[PDB]
Amino acid sequence: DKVAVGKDGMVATAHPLASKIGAEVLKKGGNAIDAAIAIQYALNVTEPMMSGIGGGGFMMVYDGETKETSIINSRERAPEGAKPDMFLDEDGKVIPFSERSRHGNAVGVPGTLKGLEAAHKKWGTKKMEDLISPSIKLTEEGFPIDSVLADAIKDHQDKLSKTAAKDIFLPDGEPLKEGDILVQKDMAKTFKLIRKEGSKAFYDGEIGRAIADVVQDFGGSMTPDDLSRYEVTTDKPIWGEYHGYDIASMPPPSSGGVFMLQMLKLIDDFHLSQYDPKSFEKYHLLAETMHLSYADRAAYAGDPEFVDVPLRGLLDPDYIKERQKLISLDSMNRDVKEGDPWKYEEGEPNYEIVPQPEDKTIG
Amino acid sequence: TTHFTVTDQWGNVVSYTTTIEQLFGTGILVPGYGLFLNNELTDFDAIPGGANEVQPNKRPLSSMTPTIVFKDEKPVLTVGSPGGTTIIASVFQTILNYFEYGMSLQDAIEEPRIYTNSLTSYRYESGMPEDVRRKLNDFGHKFGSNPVDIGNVQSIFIDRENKTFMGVADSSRNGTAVGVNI
Ligand SMILES: N[C@@H](CCC(=O)O)C(=O)O
Numbered sequence: 001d002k003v004a005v006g007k008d009g010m011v012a013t014a015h016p017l018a019s020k021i022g023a024e025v026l027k028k029g030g031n032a033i034d035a036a037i038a039i040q041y042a043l044n045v046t047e048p049m050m051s052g053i054g055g056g057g058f059m060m061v062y063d064g065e066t067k068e069t070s071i072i073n074s075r076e077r078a079p080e081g082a083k084p085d086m087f088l089d090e091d092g093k094v095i096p097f098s099e100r101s102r103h104g105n106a107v108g109v110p111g112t113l114k115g116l117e118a119a120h121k122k123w124g125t126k127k128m129e130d131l132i133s134p135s136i137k138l139t140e141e142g143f144p145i146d147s148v149l150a151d152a153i154k155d156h157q158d159k160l161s162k163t164a165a166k167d168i169f170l171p172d173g174e175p176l177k178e179g180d181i182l183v184q185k186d187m188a189k190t191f192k193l194i195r196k197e198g199s200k201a202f203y204d205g206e207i208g209r210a211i212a213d214v215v216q217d218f219g220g221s222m223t224p225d226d227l228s229r230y231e232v233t234t235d236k237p238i239w240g241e242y243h244g245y246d247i248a249s250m251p252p253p254s255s256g257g258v259f260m261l262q263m264l265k266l267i268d269d270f271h272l273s274q275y276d277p278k279s280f281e282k283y284h285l286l287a288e289t290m291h292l293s294y295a296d297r298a299a300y301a302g303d304p305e306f307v308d309v310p311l312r313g314l315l316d317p318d319y320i321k322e323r324q325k326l327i328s329l330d331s332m333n334r335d336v337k338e339g340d341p342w343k344y345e346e347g348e349p350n351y352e353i354v355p356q357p358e359d360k361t362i363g
Numbered sequence: 364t365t366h367f368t369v370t371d372q373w374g375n376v377v378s379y380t381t382t383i384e385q386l387f388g389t390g391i392l393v394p395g396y397g398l399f400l401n402n403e404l405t406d407f408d409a410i411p412g413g414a415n416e417v418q419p420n421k422r423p424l425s426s427m428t429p430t431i432v433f434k435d436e437k438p439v440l441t442v443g444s445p446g447g448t449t450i451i452a453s454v455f456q457t458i459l460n461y462f463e464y465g466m467s468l469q470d471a472i473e474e475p476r477i478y479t480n481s482l483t484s485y486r487y488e489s490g491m492p493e494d495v496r497r498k499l500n501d502f503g504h505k506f507g508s509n510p511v512d513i514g515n516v517q518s519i520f521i522d523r524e525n526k527t528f529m530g531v532a533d534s535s536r537n538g539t540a541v542g543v544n545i
């Protein structure tokens with residue numbers, strides 16, 4: 001079921017066998033964070049191509065109670081061995097996305113596990129074992145794969161062959177079809193181990209070292225030192241108001257918050273709801289607006305510990321006005337360039353504008 | 364990338380977008396652990412010298428946009444998508460459909476999206492009428508000859524006036540929403 005209503009809780013997840021599990025947490029009196037944690041493990045098992053403890057995330061929570069809003073930033077970090085031009089070949093040319101995509105250098109230190117643990121105790125009021133067990137059952141005893149997972153495996157036959165994954169996702173010759181049962185005994189092993197010795201099995205354990213092995217085996221420079229150094233952060237949201245509402249979204253090192261808000265700010269003054277939703281007018285104004293914001297992102301997005309991002313300027317009322325000049329019903333803007341938000345924020349860039357190519361997270 | 368959201372009975376709200384980048388990330392399964400490994404670092408720009416160049420210990424730029432909308436200092440809506448760099452676009456368009464067009468929440472999500480990040484990159488969800496696509500492309504756009512499913516919004520609306528929550532999952536995946544009572 002795709003829609004639903006609740007009084008004492010609610011949960012909506014990418015996979016029905018994740019949902020479903022979060023709901024059980026709430027039914028037992030556990031809170032949203034408890035449930036969120038449970039869901040992430042469940043998704044890791046049931047939607048393994050999408051999210052995982054071998055990756056990162058941003059967890060936005062609104063507190064109780066405290067009534068403040070915060071964000072567990074568990075995005076991966078590059079190992080100390082990584083290099084600014086590690087993605088160029090020996091001729092100084094960018095290495096094809098398909099190739100970069102799989103290389104050891106691509107793998108950043110996974111942060112999700114520490115982030116779940118951070119959230120748990122900041123908020124969590126259950127575990128340190130209950131929330132991971134149901135995912136261990138699905139890993140150990142398996143489950144039938146849905147359309148989307150089936151099609152991931154088919155669309156990525158060639159990547160999946162190259163790796164240890166082929167034994168279990170490409171069992172004999174071919175890739176599991178909808179309904180086939182996916183069992184991840186080794187993943188269950190790891191999850192049981194996470195339950196017992198906590199996170200440190202990961203960042204100070206055999207798994208951490210295991211990962212360091214493979215990243216190097218595939219050309220990467222990850223050491224267990226890198227893992228042991230890794231730290232999640234907490235971020236306070238980027239805010240903004242629109243149609244009389246306060247929106248809390250992601251700050252750098254995500255591009256999401258700023259430019260989604262900027263997109264709204266730009267589009268607001270046009271009052272699109274005059275136009276039919278599926279009208280030329282609309283799509284064009286949306287399109288033109290996207291072009292501007294995405295151009296700004298290409299020049300000025302990045303981890304603020306390392307760079308200065310003009311958050312004030314990018315969302316300035318006067319910047320919006322300047323840029324809305326570009327957006328008309330009477331033409332498509334051909335000169336798609338970044339704006340100068342520095343004219344509105346004290347400071348200047350500690351970086352240049354490098355034009356870039358094509359990143360196959362597409363077809 | 365996936366997004367999922369939770370609301371409880373003590374007024375906590377979770378909007379959580381989490382990923383390993385490409386589907387299966389790098390593709391690499393930590394041997395004898397089953398764990399798939401991210402290629403998140405390939406969110407870094409290739410050609411270095413920008414703000415999103417690779418550096419040691421640097422987190423590569425994300426497009427994840429977990430969001431909560433508030434009416435009068437009190438959360439009312441939760442929004443978040445996956446879909447790589449198109450996430451920004453998905454959330455923004457959902458938000459439009461919900462507040463500017465005042466659409467039903469599910470209708471907001473299911474309303475065709477577009478995404479385009481330069482004059483060379485256009486995508487659209489099935490639903491944009493042909494006459495309209497044709498007229499847009501005459502005007503100078505490059506909407507492909509066939510559409511693609513953009514994003515996967517899950518969102519939870521918090522209904523004070525009826526003291527309930529509504530939850531919805533985008534049909535793009537097999538997402539599901541389930542409430543809790545007692
Ligand atoms: N690289 C994307 C997520 C991966 C995807 O959605 O394919 C981001 O963090 O913005």
Ligand SMILES: [Mg+2]
Pocket residue numbers: 472473488512513533534535
């Ligand atoms: Mg859709």
